[PDB]
Amino acid sequence: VLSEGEWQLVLHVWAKVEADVAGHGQDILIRLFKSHPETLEKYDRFKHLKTEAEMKASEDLKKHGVRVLTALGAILKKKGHHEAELKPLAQSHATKHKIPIKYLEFISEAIIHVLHSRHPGDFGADAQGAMNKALELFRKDIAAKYKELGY
Ligand code: HEM
Known part of the structure; x- marks a missing residue:
């Protein structure tokens, strides 16, 4: 689980992505x-x-x-x-x-790669851990939904 504090680390660095959504998207897709x-x-x-x-x-x-x-x-x-x-x-x-x-999983790694490259000042060990946990929760919920739909 993430604490509220960890969610704030996640949404803080996400606000940096939201400063340039298109440029972040290009870097993440190219990395993937x-x-x-x-x-x-x-x-x-x-x-x-x-x-x-x-x-x-x-x-x-x-x-x-x-x-x-x-x-x-x-x-x-x-x-x-x-x-x-x-x-x-x-x-x-x-x-x-x-x-x-x-x-x-691969796109989660690509997101971590780009966040670290563009926002090291806002992506220390705790912020990296929080983002890893937030993306892992997302991926695991999707995996369970995939299985429920027969995929
Ligand atoms: C964070 C993970 C993901 C999010 C939030 C996401 C979100 C979306 C959204 C909003 C769309 C358009 C609406 C829809 O068809 O559902 C979409 C389309 C699509 N996405 Fe994903 N997606 C991700 C993971 C992936 C990955 C890992 C790939 C790698 C192949 C992928 C490729 C697909 C493709 C092929 C389309 C159709 C694109 C087109 O031809 O118009 N997505 N995605």
Whole structure:
């Protein structure tokens, strides 16, 4: 569980992401694709992009990153009480996009990577631990929803 204090560490650094949602989204997606090229291959809409220059030039990829971080921001602001936000996400990702649960672990690592790179002053050991726990709770609730939907 996170304490209220730990939720504040999470929402404090998230307010730094919210200063530049689009730029953070691009850095996280590019990090994910570089770390785990199987993830890009699974994105029919984006799999054409072959290089980092092409990825940073894609307005579609940029708008997608904004959707992702907007949805995740709304989830984190619920401080674990995200059942309602998770339902449509689990539904689309299990049954429509067919995203393997492991990919949610990979994007969590990519989020930690970018937060650390851009906000080290707001991402000390306690803030890193709090964000890891918040994303782990998210991933595990999605995993349980995946299984409930038969995926
Ligand atoms: C924090 C984790 C995630 C959040 C909050 C998130 C959120 C979203 C949202 C809000 C959309 C548009 C609405 C919808 O279809 O549900 C979406 C679409 C999609 N997402 Fe995720 N998502 C994440 C994890 C992933 C991962 C790990 C991948 C890697 C393949 C992924 C790829 C998919 C794809 C392929 C679409 C459709 C994009 C398109 O072609 O328009 N997402 N996501």
